[PDB]
């Protein structure tokens, strides 16, 4: 019912600025202060500021006074937060939470922000078929290596989402400003060469959508 839907992941070069939006729904918008929290990759949460959607008044965490500029549009029940003078240290996940005179009772899904000088690169997807037999763990594990892409968010499913058990999608590792990721699927031995197994990779940043069928060598 109550819902705060934030804008998508974003990539911007240092020195730029960005305005992330936090669309509110399911309640009286002007009756709750909208707070903005920051989660630095791997680190803890850090509060940015709040805003009275009714009169546009803000309270801030001294440390963010020159960076965040909180505004609201009552017309559509939307709350914004612009970040000026961006640096790498600004790359984090940003949330918008509603406070209810005690704590944050509703949060948006968050907005992944990457501030980098690196260029967006479409991934290169390679199927990992076992070497002429091999695998034995629950009989025959397959792979899908997603290499040399930059905008971190990449989605990997198997058989368009049907294969969901036995899957282990490994978190990306930044190498020279290009991420590498891999996923495995442990299927039943009577299932693989016989049936079709395809790993699907989607990388919105570059508009690529790769459907990669695992054939035996």
């Amino acid at each position: 019912e109550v819902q705060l839907q934030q804008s998508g992941p974003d990539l911007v070069k240092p020195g730029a600025s960005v305005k992330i939006s936090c669309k509110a729904s399911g309640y009286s918008f002007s009756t709750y202060y909208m707070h903005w929290v920051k989660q630095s990759h791997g680190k803890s949460l850090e509060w940015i500021g709040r805003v009275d959607p009714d009169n546009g008044g803000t309270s801030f965490n001294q440390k963010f006074k020159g960076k965040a500029i909180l505004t609201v549009d009552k017309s559509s029940s939307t709350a914004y937060m612009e970040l000026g003078s961006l640096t790498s240290e600004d790359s984090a996940v940003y949330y918008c939470a509603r406070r209810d005179d005690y704590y944050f009772d509703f949060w948006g899904q968050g907005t992944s922000l990457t501030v980098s000088s690196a260029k967006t690169t479409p991934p290169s997807v390679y199927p990992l078929a076992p070497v002429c037999g091999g695998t034995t763990g629950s009989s025959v594990t397959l792979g899908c290596l997603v290499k040399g892409y930059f905008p971190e968010p990449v989605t990997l499913t198997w058989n368009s989402g049907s294969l969901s058990s036995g899957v282990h999608t490994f978190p990306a590792v930044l190498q020279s400003g290009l991420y590498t990721l891999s996923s495995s699927v442990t299927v039943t031995s009577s299932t693989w060469p016989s049936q079709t197994i395809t790993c699907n990779v989607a990388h919105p940043a570059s508009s690529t959508k790769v459907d990669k069928k695992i054939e035996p060598r």
Binding site: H35, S44, L45, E46, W47, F60, N61, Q62, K63, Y95, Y102, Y103, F104, D105, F106, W107, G108, Q109, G110, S124, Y126, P127, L128, A129, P130, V131, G134, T135, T136, G137, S138, T141, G143, L145, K147, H168, T169, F170, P171, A172, V173, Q175, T180, L181, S182, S184, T186, R217
Partner: protein, 210 residues
Amino acid sequence: QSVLSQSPAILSASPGEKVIMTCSPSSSVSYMQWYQQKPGSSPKPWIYSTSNLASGVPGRFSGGGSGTSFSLTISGVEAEDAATYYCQQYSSHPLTFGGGTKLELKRADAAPTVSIFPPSSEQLTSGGASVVCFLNNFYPKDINVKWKIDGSERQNGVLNSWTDQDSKDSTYSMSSTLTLTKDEYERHNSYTCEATHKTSTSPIVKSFNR
């Protein structure tokens, strides 16, 4: 300033155990709020006003404390409790959070299932070569992998990544990728992946010969 310190950082309990989470503010706090955060999701309201459970929180949880020492106690740690818990304050300014407490499940040891995959012919076409090795479903998160190309160990060009503790069986998985140039790849024959884990007296190996 009212800095919140949480301890421990990482907490591992077997299902059914009783766990106490602590949150110390360097100065008296009226109330303490607690949040639960599960990887890939935004935090969720857990406890407000230092003892009130938010909607959806089971009775096995209880918050408490006064002034500069608050706590969150789970009477029977269940599987779904594995997450990082954050305490939050606003008695002072600005609004601060604690460093978090990650609760991870303690379970019986399990040996990993190793798999080695030679370079895809598609990659070789593109003049690159990556040999991959998946060490799956093992328990002691601590594991050691070593690559060898013709008996000679290669610590250069290896990329490792680990997964969060699995929701279904409480195990970890690992991915070890060794990348070489197609020309350097073809200047050899035996490629070996060697895992060293507590579940075995000897190393676990996986190899293939060109």
